[PDB]
Design an enzyme around this catalytic site. Structure first.
Site, PDB file in Angstrom:
ATOM      1  N   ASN A 113      40.612  -1.135 -80.752  1.00  8.44           N
ATOM      2  CA  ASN A 113      41.550  -0.358 -79.885  1.00  8.44           C
ATOM      3  C   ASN A 113      41.097  -0.467 -78.450  1.00  8.44           C
ATOM      4  O   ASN A 113      39.931  -0.451 -78.050  1.00  8.44           O
ATOM      5  CB  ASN A 113      41.724   1.043 -80.323  1.00  8.44           C
ATOM      6  CG  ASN A 113      40.702   1.980 -79.739  1.00  8.44           C
ATOM      7  OD1 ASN A 113      40.758   2.524 -78.636  1.00  8.44           O
ATOM      8  ND2 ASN A 113      39.529   2.088 -80.481  1.00  8.44           N
ATOM      9  N   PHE A 117      42.429   6.230 -73.092  1.00 10.26           N
ATOM     10  CA  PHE A 117      42.563   7.671 -72.845  1.00 10.26           C
ATOM     11  C   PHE A 117      44.039   7.993 -72.493  1.00 10.26           C
ATOM     12  O   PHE A 117      44.251   8.728 -71.564  1.00 10.26           O
ATOM     13  CB  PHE A 117      41.683   8.261 -71.764  1.00 10.26           C
ATOM     14  CG  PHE A 117      40.170   8.365 -72.052  1.00 10.26           C
ATOM     15  CD1 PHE A 117      39.695   8.503 -73.356  1.00 10.26           C
ATOM     16  CD2 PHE A 117      39.228   8.367 -71.021  1.00 10.26           C
ATOM     17  CE1 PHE A 117      38.338   8.627 -73.611  1.00 10.26           C
ATOM     18  CE2 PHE A 117      37.875   8.480 -71.278  1.00 10.26           C
ATOM     19  CZ  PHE A 117      37.429   8.656 -72.619  1.00 10.26           C
ATOM     20  N   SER A 183      33.455   5.680 -74.168  1.00  9.08           N
ATOM     21  CA  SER A 183      34.576   4.846 -74.402  1.00  9.08           C
ATOM     22  C   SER A 183      34.343   3.477 -73.751  1.00  9.08           C
ATOM     23  O   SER A 183      33.959   3.413 -72.595  1.00  9.08           O
ATOM     24  CB  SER A 183      35.854   5.463 -73.705  1.00  9.08           C
ATOM     25  OG  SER A 183      36.868   4.546 -73.884  1.00  9.08           O
ATOM     26  N   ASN A 185      36.770   1.634 -72.956  1.00  4.18           N
ATOM     27  CA  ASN A 185      38.106   1.322 -72.401  1.00  4.18           C
ATOM     28  C   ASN A 185      38.430   2.007 -71.099  1.00  4.18           C
ATOM     29  O   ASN A 185      39.632   1.962 -70.729  1.00  4.18           O
ATOM     30  CB  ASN A 185      39.186   1.599 -73.430  1.00  4.18           C
ATOM     31  CG  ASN A 185      38.906   0.856 -74.744  1.00  4.18           C
ATOM     32  OD1 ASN A 185      38.578  -0.336 -74.709  1.00  4.18           O
ATOM     33  ND2 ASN A 185      39.069   1.543 -75.909  1.00  4.18           N
ATOM     34  N   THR A 186      37.447   2.587 -70.445  1.00  8.01           N
ATOM     35  CA  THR A 186      37.658   3.182 -69.082  1.00  8.01           C
ATOM     36  C   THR A 186      36.549   2.552 -68.246  1.00  8.01           C
ATOM     37  O   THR A 186      35.398   2.727 -68.513  1.00  8.01           O
ATOM     38  CB  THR A 186      37.619   4.711 -69.127  1.00  8.01           C
ATOM     39  OG1 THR A 186      38.838   5.135 -69.789  1.00  8.01           O
ATOM     40  CG2 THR A 186      37.592   5.315 -67.755  1.00  8.01           C
ATOM     41  N   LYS A 223      28.477  12.202 -76.644  1.00  7.47           N
ATOM     42  CA  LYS A 223      28.855  11.092 -77.473  1.00  7.47           C
ATOM     43  C   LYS A 223      28.515   9.764 -76.894  1.00  7.47           C
ATOM     44  O   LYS A 223      28.881   9.481 -75.783  1.00  7.47           O
ATOM     45  CB  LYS A 223      30.341  11.097 -77.890  1.00  7.47           C
ATOM     46  CG  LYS A 223      30.701  10.047 -78.825  1.00  7.47           C
ATOM     47  CD  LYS A 223      32.061  10.309 -79.504  1.00  7.47           C
ATOM     48  CE  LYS A 223      32.511   9.284 -80.484  1.00  7.47           C
ATOM     49  NZ  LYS A 223      33.861   9.596 -81.088  1.00  7.47           N
ATOM     50  N   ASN A 252      30.269   6.009 -80.728  1.00  3.74           N
ATOM     51  CA  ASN A 252      31.595   5.507 -80.411  1.00  3.74           C
ATOM     52  C   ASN A 252      31.809   4.103 -80.996  1.00  3.74           C
ATOM     53  O   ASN A 252      30.924   3.549 -81.737  1.00  3.74           O
ATOM     54  CB  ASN A 252      31.754   5.551 -78.898  1.00  3.74           C
ATOM     55  CG  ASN A 252      33.225   5.850 -78.495  1.00  3.74           C
ATOM     56  OD1 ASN A 252      34.178   5.218 -78.956  1.00  3.74           O
ATOM     57  ND2 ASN A 252      33.292   6.852 -77.587  1.00  3.74           N
TER      58      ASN A 252
HETATM   59  C1  LIG Z   1      42.264   4.224 -82.364  1.00  2.85           C
HETATM   60  C2  LIG Z   1      41.022   4.923 -81.966  1.00  2.85           C
HETATM   61  C3  LIG Z   1      40.969   5.801 -80.936  1.00  2.85           C
HETATM   62  C4  LIG Z   1      39.879   6.477 -80.563  1.00  2.85           C
HETATM   63  N1  LIG Z   1      39.806   7.303 -79.526  1.00  2.85           N
HETATM   64  C5  LIG Z   1      38.723   8.080 -79.250  1.00  2.85           C
HETATM   65  C6  LIG Z   1      38.541   9.078 -78.275  1.00  2.85           C
HETATM   66  O1  LIG Z   1      39.687   9.418 -77.584  1.00  2.85           O
HETATM   67  N2  LIG Z   1      37.468   9.696 -78.002  1.00  2.85           N
HETATM   68  C7  LIG Z   1      36.226   9.364 -78.687  1.00  2.85           C
HETATM   69  O2  LIG Z   1      35.279  10.012 -78.377  1.00  2.85           O
HETATM   70  N3  LIG Z   1      36.331   8.503 -79.632  1.00  2.85           N
HETATM   71  C8  LIG Z   1      37.379   7.811 -79.953  1.00  2.85           C
HETATM   72  N4  LIG Z   1      37.447   6.906 -80.940  1.00  2.85           N
HETATM   73  C9  LIG Z   1      36.151   6.628 -81.660  1.00  2.85           C
HETATM   74  C10 LIG Z   1      36.053   7.372 -82.954  1.00  2.85           C
HETATM   75  O3  LIG Z   1      35.926   8.744 -82.735  1.00  2.85           O
HETATM   76  C11 LIG Z   1      34.774   6.914 -83.716  1.00  2.85           C
HETATM   77  O4  LIG Z   1      33.645   7.201 -82.863  1.00  2.85           O
HETATM   78  C12 LIG Z   1      34.815   5.393 -84.056  1.00  2.85           C
HETATM   79  O5  LIG Z   1      36.071   4.878 -84.341  1.00  2.85           O
HETATM   80  C13 LIG Z   1      33.867   5.097 -85.269  1.00  2.85           C
HETATM   81  O6  LIG Z   1      34.299   5.768 -86.469  1.00  2.85           O
HETATM   82  P1  LIG Z   1      35.163   5.019 -87.553  1.00  2.85           P
HETATM   83  O7  LIG Z   1      34.528   3.678 -87.861  1.00  2.85           O
HETATM   84  O8  LIG Z   1      35.134   5.978 -88.742  1.00  2.85           O
HETATM   85  O9  LIG Z   1      36.585   4.897 -87.000  1.00  2.85           O
HETATM   86  C14 LIG Z   1      38.589   6.223 -81.315  1.00  2.85           C
HETATM   87  C15 LIG Z   1      38.716   5.350 -82.381  1.00  2.85           C
HETATM   88  C16 LIG Z   1      39.825   4.664 -82.752  1.00  2.85           C
HETATM   89  C17 LIG Z   1      39.816   3.759 -83.948  1.00  2.85           C
HETATM   90  O1  LIG Z   2      41.171   6.022 -75.626  1.00  7.81           O
HETATM   91  C1  LIG Z   2      40.464   5.037 -76.000  1.00  7.81           C
HETATM   92  O2  LIG Z   2      40.627   3.835 -75.689  1.00  7.81           O
HETATM   93  C2  LIG Z   2      39.195   5.318 -76.853  1.00  7.81           C
HETATM   94  C3  LIG Z   2      38.353   6.193 -76.318  1.00  7.81           C
HETATM   95  C4  LIG Z   2      36.972   6.244 -76.945  1.00  7.81           C
HETATM   96  O3  LIG Z   2      36.111   7.079 -76.625  1.00  7.81           O
HETATM   97  N1  LIG Z   2      36.697   5.283 -77.883  1.00  7.81           N
HETATM   98  C5  LIG Z   2      37.536   4.338 -78.229  1.00  7.81           C
HETATM   99  O4  LIG Z   2      37.329   3.451 -79.068  1.00  7.81           O
HETATM  100  N2  LIG Z   2      38.859   4.295 -77.734  1.00  7.81           N
END
Ligand SMILES: Cc1cc2nc3c(=O)[nH]c(=O)nc-3n(C[C@H](O)[C@H](O)[C@H](O)COP(=O)(O)O)c2cc1C
Ligand SMILES: O=C(O)c1cc(=O)[nH]c(=O)[nH]1
Ligand SMILES: COC(=O)/C(C#N)=C1\SCC(=O)N1c1ccccc1F
EC number: 1.3.5.2
Length: 363
Positions: A113, A117, A183, A185-186, A223, A252
């Site tokens: 992804n 944000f 993140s 992505n910022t 985080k 993350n």
């Molecule tokens: C589509 C998507 C969006 C995410 N957005 C956020 C986010 O806004 N803030 C954040 O701290 N983590 C974000 N994450 C990270 C997840 O919280 C997690 O740290 C990461 O995906 C690893 O866990 P997983 O393998 O179970 O998905 C995002 C993950 C995915 C897949």
């Molecule tokens: O908004 C996102 O792009 C997002 C934020 C974050 O903390 N981690 C991530 O994988 N995507």
């Protein structure tokens, strides 16, 4: 029954019909309405954890990102999560990146992804949480706490002030807050994990938190990324101890692309989640637990899709675990699955409960 039907029929069909962003929006809508198998697994006492000033009925939470804007909290509890984290929320509303911005790697059980944000913003989310504030207060008391994950707007000229604004606006509504400095992505965000930047930022965040009234005063966690150098990790640990940060969320998504990825979309820009992240995250947890002498609670996240994956993180030093990407592949039944398997493995390995397994590999 359900686990197989979702994994073999429902989820592949949804994936065949819908691009992943549309599928996620549908999922948020369905969960918000409670259109879910109400989960039949009853949490046993061996799954209760006490940490961060709270009781957690089970240690399996929904990771940030799935409910960015706080629309589906109650549906997530219905799904059987022990705790729910919303966000990331940014101070002002913002759209995030152009579409497409999320990509499935089904051969890898992974996602990439680059949302950037996308956020309804503090005010919107504040009012959504306030509409259910006392329903949450009861949930929290009953062992079902709520975390709020804070981010930074793209055009902000002062990152620490963005985070401070989140503390002031959503802190009073949260059982814990997350300073998301990881993140991928910022632009520039991950530089906030650097020692001097992180110390300045977190000193400001903690001062703002400490200014809240006592019943509205959340724990504060940071985080972190899975891609940190050893120096970066050491530095983070030092700062967390120096300032009395309440916990860490590890990890993350990764900007790495481990060798062996098969998905056609593996070279898309963004953070990678799911199975290829699992052991990089576990290892990060293990390092951070050692560096902080086991005295700083860790919420472990990245590639959890089974009870064995959960227990590996717990034994490495996590007090709690979270998941997101496993839902895309297995759907809601994965929650109960993780919990049932975790309880079975705890019994097999001679632990009285989760609490006894936290950090067990270090002993
Ligand atoms: C589509 C998507 C969006 C995410 N957005 C956020 C986010 O806004 N803030 C954040 O701290 N983590 C974000 N994450 C990270 C997840 O919280 C997690 O740290 C990461 O995906 C690893 O866990 P997983 O393998 O179970 O998905 C995002 C993950 C995915 C897949
Ligand atoms: O908004 C996102 O792009 C997002 C934020 C974050 O903390 N981690 C991530 O994988 N995507
Ligand atoms: C057409 O879409 C559905 O049927 C969904 C979805 N999404 C259903 S039916 C029961 C259920 O649980 N979900 C669901 C909810 C959240 C995440 C994934 C899901 F499949």
């Amino acid at each position: 029954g359900d686990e197989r039907f979702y994994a073999e029929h429902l989820m592949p069909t949804l994936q065949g019909l819908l691009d992943p962003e549309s599928a996620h929006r549908l999922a948020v809508r369905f969960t918000s309405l409670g259109l879910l198998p109400r989960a039949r697994f009853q949490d046993s006492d061996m799954l209760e954890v006490r940490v961060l000033g709270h009781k957690f009925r089970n240690p399996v939470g929904i990771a940030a990102g799935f409910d960015k804007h706080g629309e589906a909290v109650d549906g997530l509890y219905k799904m059987g999560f022990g705790f729910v984290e919303i966000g990331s929320v940014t101070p002002k509303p913002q759209e995030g990146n152009p579409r497409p911005r999320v990509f499935r790697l089904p051969e890898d059980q992974a996602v990439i992804n680059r949302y950037g944000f996308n956020s309804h913003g503090l005010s919107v989310v504040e009012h959504r949480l306030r509409a259910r504030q006392q329903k949450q207060a009861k949930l929290t008391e009953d062992g079902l706490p709520l975390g709020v994950n804070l981010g930074k707007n793209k055009t902000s000229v002062d990152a620490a002030e963005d985070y401070a604004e989140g503390v002031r606006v959503l802190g009073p509504l949260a059982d814990y807050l997350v300073v998301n400095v990881s993140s991928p992505n910022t632009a520039g965000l991950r530089s906030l994990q650097g020692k001097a930047e992180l110390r300045r930022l977190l000193t400001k965040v903690l001062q703002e938190r400490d200014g809240l009234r006592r019943v509205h005063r959340p724990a504060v966690l940071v985080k972190i990324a899975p891609d940190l150098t050893s120096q970066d990790k050491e530095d983070i640990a030092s700062v967390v101890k120096e300032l009395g940060i309440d916990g860490l969320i590890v990890t993350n998504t990764t900007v790495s692309r481990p060798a062996g990825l098969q998905g056609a979309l593996r070279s898309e820009t963004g953070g990678l989640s799911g199975k290829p992240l699992r052991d990089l995250s576990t290892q990060t947890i293990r390092e951070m637990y050692a560096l902080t002498q086991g005295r700083v609670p860790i919420i472990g996240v990245g590639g959890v899709s089974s009870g064995q994956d959960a227990l590996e993180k717990i034994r490495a030093g996590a007090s709690l675990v979270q998941l997101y990407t496993a839902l895309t592949f297995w759907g809601p039944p994965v929650v109960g699955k993780v919990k049932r398997e975790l309880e079975a493995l705890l019994k097999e390995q001679g632990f009285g409960g989760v609490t006894d397994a936290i950090g067990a590999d270090h002993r």
